Amino acid sequence: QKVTFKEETYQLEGKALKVGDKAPDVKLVNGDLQEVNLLKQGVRFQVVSALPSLTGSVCLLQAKHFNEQTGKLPSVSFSVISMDLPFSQGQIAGAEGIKDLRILSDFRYKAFGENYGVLLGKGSLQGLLARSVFVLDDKGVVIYKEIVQNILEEPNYEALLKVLK
Ligand SMILES: *c1nc(COCC#C)n(C)c1N
């Protein structure tokens, strides 16, 4: 699969993760500069979304939409991942009041990008994460995957909420 950004077409780098595959656990860094494991034990659904940067308008709308679901669906674990340092993630989350959302940084190991196959290849956005959504079931198996073809588009929220119902 390819991703488009205006005139640029990106190859996706890292390991291809498919619907039906066991999702790999990866090390990320949270707002307190604490290393955390992506996967949560004993929750019905885990939603893991990635975006190029929280600095961007489309990116912030995605973060705002997952912050709202965090409160509406407490039985579902929501995580948003970017290559932004935890400091900027905390600053932007603070200003926008997105305090319930689990915001994690892939900067240290690029372990999410490499293991979920959403690392953007050569181009202006190279090394940033493709806009993407994975839903895992209670076994940690991928039951839904969207890598957004046009990175200027928001994720398909309707397709996603049908998976969580
Ligand atoms: C996330 N999405 C986008 C696309 O447009 C938003 C803007 C600006 N960007 C730039 C990020 N960072």
Walk me through what this model shows.
Its EC number is 1.11.1.24. Belongs to the peroxiredoxin family. Tpx subfamily. Thiol-specific peroxidase that catalyzes the reduction of hydrogen peroxide and organic hydroperoxides to water and alcohols, respectively. Plays a role in cell protection against oxidative stress by detoxifying peroxides. The chain has 165 residues and is an alpha+beta fold. The protein has a single domain, classed as 3-Layer(aba) Sandwich (Glutaredoxin), CATH 3.40.30. Helices cover 25% and strands 28% of the residues. It contains four helices and ten strands. A five-stranded mixed beta sheet has the order 7-6-5-9-10. It has a three-stranded antiparallel beta sheet with strand order 1-2-8. The longest helix has 16 residues, at 57-72. The structure holds 3-methyl-2-(prop-2-ynoxymethyl)imidazol-4-amine (A1IAR). 3-methyl-2-(prop-2-ynoxymethyl)imidazol-4-amine binds at residues 51-53, 55-59, 152.
